[PDB]
Design a protein around this ligand. Sequence first.
Ligand SMILES: COc1cc2cc(c1Cl)NC(=O)C[C@H](O)/C(C)=C/[C@H](C)[C@@H](O)CC(=O)[C@H](OC)/C=C/C=C(\C)C2
Ligand SMILES: COc1cc2cc(c1Cl)NC(=O)C[C@H](O)/C(C)=C/[C@H](C)[C@@H](O)CC(=O)[C@H](OC)/C=C/C=C(\C)C2
Ligand SMILES: Nc1ncnc2c1ncn2[C@@H]1O[C@H](COP(=O)(O)O)[C@@H](O)[C@H]1O
Ligand SMILES: Nc1ncnc2c1ncn2[C@@H]1O[C@H](COP(=O)(O)O)[C@@H](O)[C@H]1O
Ligand SMILES: [Fe+3]
Ligand SMILES: [Fe+3]
Lengths: 678, 674
Amino acid sequence: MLVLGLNGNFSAADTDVVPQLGEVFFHDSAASLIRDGELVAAVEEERLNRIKKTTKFPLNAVRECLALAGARPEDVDAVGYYFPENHIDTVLNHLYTEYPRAPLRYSRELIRQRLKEGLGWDLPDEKLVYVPHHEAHAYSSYLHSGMDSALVLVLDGRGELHSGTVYRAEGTRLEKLADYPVPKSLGGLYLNATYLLGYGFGDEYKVMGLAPWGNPETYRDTFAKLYTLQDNGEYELHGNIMVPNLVSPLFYAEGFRPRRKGEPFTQAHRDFAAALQETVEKIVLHILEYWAKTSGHSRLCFGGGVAHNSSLNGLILKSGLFDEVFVHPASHDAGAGEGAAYAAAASLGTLERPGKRLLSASLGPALGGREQIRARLADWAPLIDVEFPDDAVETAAGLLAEGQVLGWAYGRSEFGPRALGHRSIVADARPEENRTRINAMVKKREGFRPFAPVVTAEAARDYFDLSGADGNHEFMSFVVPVLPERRTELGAVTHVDGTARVQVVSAESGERFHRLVRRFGELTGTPVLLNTSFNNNAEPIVQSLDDVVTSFLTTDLDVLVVEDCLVRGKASPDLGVLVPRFRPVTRLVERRTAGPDASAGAKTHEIHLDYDGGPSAKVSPELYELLGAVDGTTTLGDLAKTVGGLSDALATEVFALWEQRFLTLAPAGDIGPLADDG
Amino acid sequence: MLVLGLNGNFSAADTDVVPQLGEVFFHDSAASLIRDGELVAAVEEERLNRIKKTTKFPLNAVRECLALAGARPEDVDAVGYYFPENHIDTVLNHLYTEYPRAPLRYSRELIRQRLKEGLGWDLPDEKLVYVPHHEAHAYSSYLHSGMDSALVLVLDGRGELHSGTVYRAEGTRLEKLADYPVPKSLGGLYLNATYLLGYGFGDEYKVMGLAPWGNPETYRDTFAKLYTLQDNGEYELHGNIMVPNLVSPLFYAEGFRPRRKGEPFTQAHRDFAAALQETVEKIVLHILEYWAKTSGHSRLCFGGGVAHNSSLNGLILKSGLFDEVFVHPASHDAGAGEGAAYAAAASLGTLERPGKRLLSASLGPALGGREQIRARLADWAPLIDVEFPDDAVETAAGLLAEGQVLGWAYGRSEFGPRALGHRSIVADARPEENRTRINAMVKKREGFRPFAPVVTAEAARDYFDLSGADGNHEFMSFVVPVLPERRTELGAVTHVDGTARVQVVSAESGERFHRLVRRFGELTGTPVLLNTSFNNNAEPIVQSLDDVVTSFLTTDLDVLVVEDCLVRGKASPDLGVLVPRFRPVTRLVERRTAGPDASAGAKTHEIHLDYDGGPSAKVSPELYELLGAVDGTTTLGDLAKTVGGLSDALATEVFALWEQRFLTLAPAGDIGPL
Ligand SMILES: COc1cc2cc(c1Cl)NC(=O)C[C@H](O)/C(C)=C/[C@H](C)[C@@H](O)CC(=O)[C@H](OC)/C=C/C=C(\C)C2
Ligand SMILES: COc1cc2cc(c1Cl)NC(=O)C[C@H](O)/C(C)=C/[C@H](C)[C@@H](O)CC(=O)[C@H](OC)/C=C/C=C(\C)C2
Ligand SMILES: Nc1ncnc2c1ncn2[C@@H]1O[C@H](COP(=O)(O)O)[C@@H](O)[C@H]1O
Ligand SMILES: Nc1ncnc2c1ncn2[C@@H]1O[C@H](COP(=O)(O)O)[C@@H](O)[C@H]1O
Ligand SMILES: [Fe+3]
Ligand SMILES: [Fe+3]
């Protein structure tokens, strides 16, 4: 019994189903494989096509999952899609009425055309099962908790008909207790408010990160006008007929005006974020007080995108309403795609469930066999120096105690938004200066947000208040208070309110990463490390080896530890050996605008990525001529000869383009088909 | 007392307040000037920037309006805006949250910046009055009716808070009687349905022209699921939570598939249109039947964008609910902008009103004087031959009787979407083949589209069934039955259901157009002409003399009659003498996508217009280099030298760009001030 789980839209690599398809129309594409009850493989498509939260069809993800399970496509017994057919097809129909040139292809035809053309897989109609969206979430959240029964709460932006659902789960039976209609969406409320802060979809975690810097009483009475707590765990959100945003009209009427790009955060912005977060907490705790009493249950599984609010999840932990609480590492739509697999298996015969509780998100493709990895690092030789220590973990620990900031890349990639010891950036958690050091120089982001600690299972309670209920801390789902005595020790990983989004690593969740943090603590007396995702501002978490090396060379990390190899950037690296390739979404443009006196105006040359919200950059006329000659095999140095050679100016310009990921730059060939190891 | 009426958004000529601002965010930009209660000038900005239903700020319209009034900006006592200040600023604020680079500039600052940079006009805060949207509609509709009391009904998509308002008007007082909220919008429903036929905003009257070919029975019971008539003039529309469109989810579920662009109009499409049209008629007539007997008024003024549904109007006329109906020639948001002036004059002092019913929509800029028009037609000499007959109207009537299709350009242009003998294309209304060919060869549009007749006042009741209430027909507001014994005689202008959207012209509404129609009837026996708007499918109604000539040369019209000059195309027109100039929205692009094996794809070259829903076109490498050298003064012939001469392939390719209006092609210089 081998079941594929799908979520996301149906766009190909190089175009969208309709032009410039909105980034919110079925985002976080991913594929998932279950074999007789167990999650064998799962990767988000963003990791492979390199587009954060991509809406594109997850064809690569499916190919990666089949190969990790050793299956032909024809081996698959059923496919499950995370939304009911009529719902996705009605949304597609609406996109088609606004773009009258798009052919009328709905999801069943589009799903099958992608699999037939991209994999040779001739999918029979009887194997495609569409699933209720919150049902998908709930299966994913509950079947991996290792619980025998629980109250299941699902809260996201919206499914087909609801923005919230409550389930009782027992064995493998889901039974629905309640729902909340779409207009009441807390996902929607959060995202609306995020727009007022100059941010957009996928920046909610930044808003949550900013809220401790703010005072929730400044705008408490303002938000009070937008919601009402009612009896029996009901609430209303108060809409308006002005604009499709719950929050902006009222706040505009009181003089709040939204933040501009590159504007610093004011005290009003900080307070807004605090009051926003206190509202969502206040409402979600109101739902849960009622359903914990009405159902009498002591265990909670919380799912949906709202369940990536670490701050909310810690408040639930310390509320005293439950004894255990579980949150899946991928509680957003990528997990609904996994849960769609289980629901398809229950729809089609019997449903087999996971053995025990999920401890490791390490479910993606791996970096490769050590023969490949050594061979590939040799292709990168003109840019890197590479050692092979006897104990990489042992070496890496000392480096961290010395003060180095490390890239840590091992095994299969983490499913979901958190890096957990497989695609991480690692450094000592004690120096409070490491925040501005890493959160600016090396990775290039915003410094108001503290970093996440990783602690050992053994010393965990000697640093953090993991009390209240028993939550799962293997995936950083809960923000917990840092013990006030240890707060000054942990300067890099403690917020202004004293809390921290803690990963607790054990020998069962991650042996190599546990040895690393333990060793470091034996050498320092502090078995806590800082743990952030291995990616710069312009990419999702890195996936392939080439991904990892690219990201290391284009950031300011000291050392890279990748599958026991130590990697440092050479004296002066030879960019000219890198072979430039276009990404499927790369576009290279010469533009004329209108000019004064109705003339042909300013000639500019630009590179950009063709997808909604994609970046763009001006280029010089020489880069334009060089880039246009890119054939996907010739190296940068050889292409540079048609414009006079790779000068330092050109190579600096190309390097800045590489940083922003407008095109692939990597040595000739590739690592080859990923190894089989056991 | 000189008051400016404003409506539209606040974008400059070459950019929008946010990038790719949607075509429905405050469309139909226009400016109106009232003086002593008389409407002395009014023009839609679309006529001047050549962007159909544009949202961009009506800067050029204000300037043209002051010129027509002989006024300076300092002469203006007040400016009205057709929406309340909090509403437009809240919507601006929404767009800004979605585009964090846009500076926070709200409407008052943007109106003042536009008037100051564009006209040297420091408008004071105390002179800018914002107006409730349906109040602005009602004033415009009612004050031009000639009536001293009426029921005034305003239906559009939405004002600030309502989709419909009902008023009582007595003297110059408006008294609100009722309103319908925004989610009951009938204009919203019509637009929603329109999107299912492969059309978009601005195409609603094509759907209404398609309706008569359909059977409203097929989908009556489906549309019945989307509304409920309730007691005492109330109704409900039934929404959904799936998509922001009220019609498509239910129709998808029943197997209806949205038409694609370029695909034929199937019978299911025609039936859908007919049902939609019947639905709106049943609702509006339900509203009107109630409010006619409740308010006691025998006279109705109908305004708001929905009042441009000629078929609905013809039904209101035949319903017997009223003795008199008036519809304004611009009942859509440009009329609201005019009404905003009346409402601002009433906020600051007393309201002076028109003394007569509006008979003529001829309210925009003219073509120019006698000698500046002769001189500018001479600049077109390499492309046109020109005759000056003793009696142009007499000559044009004979040409029409010999089967010629004429362009007709006289005087000040029509305010509102209809052409009424000032920017018209006309032909014999009798042969049914004229409908087939003017649809296929001239206007280049769908075969099912009807053509509107113009008839003299004296003969109207010989051809059309005007019976029922007395409505105003100077502006083609009412669809009326063509009398049964005349349908064969009027083959081109009788729609499939025996109706015509008729213009009754008189010596008082349009003396010269009336003379043309009267003389044609003396020559032929039929004082009726086909009268369609003078524009190809790429442009709004032609405004200026250059516009007229350009449109004439790029559509297949036989003869152009413009201000008593007979204009024909030369056998071999010399395009090389024309000076290419970019429009402010014109954009040239050389583009590479990805290609096989992650290579740079092959180059392509595009010209496009930079606005939401703007067209684009592929161009050759040679033409792409030629347009790169455009400087606004060099001729196309000299420009072509740098790619080896204006070959026939280039002239042909440029001609097709010109026909789609991607750039301006016209002789060196211009006509000058008028
Ligand atoms: C212009 O056309 C629109 C616009 C909106 C709504 C709909 C439509 Cl058709 N109607 C839907 O049904 C949306 C659909 O279900 C969907 C994209 C679901 C994904 C998988 C969730 O993630 C939705 C969200 O939660 C999203 O924020 C990310 C909120 C979006 C609101 C909107 C995008 C407003
Ligand atoms: C994504 O952002 C949206 C979207 C919609 C609504 C609003 C907003 Cl902010 N909110 C408003 O308030 C609309 C505003 O007042 C406005 C543009 C009024 C114009 C000038 C009138 O003409 C309205 C119509 O009649 C129009 O269809 C042509 C409505 C289309 C529906 C919509 C455009 C749906
Ligand atoms: N930290 C967060 N707090 C509140 N809402 C969030 C957070 N992260 C994501 N969401 C919302 O979750 C929804 C997407 O979840 P899903 O559809 O389950 O992927 C969107 O409405 C987001 O705004
Ligand atoms: N012939 C028509 N029938 C029905 N509604 C129309 C028609 N023409 C325009 N509208 C609607 O009127 C609204 C715009 O009017 P306004 O806002 O007054 O310019 C939109 O909702 C249009 O779809
Ligand atoms: Fe979800
Ligand atoms: Fe309106």
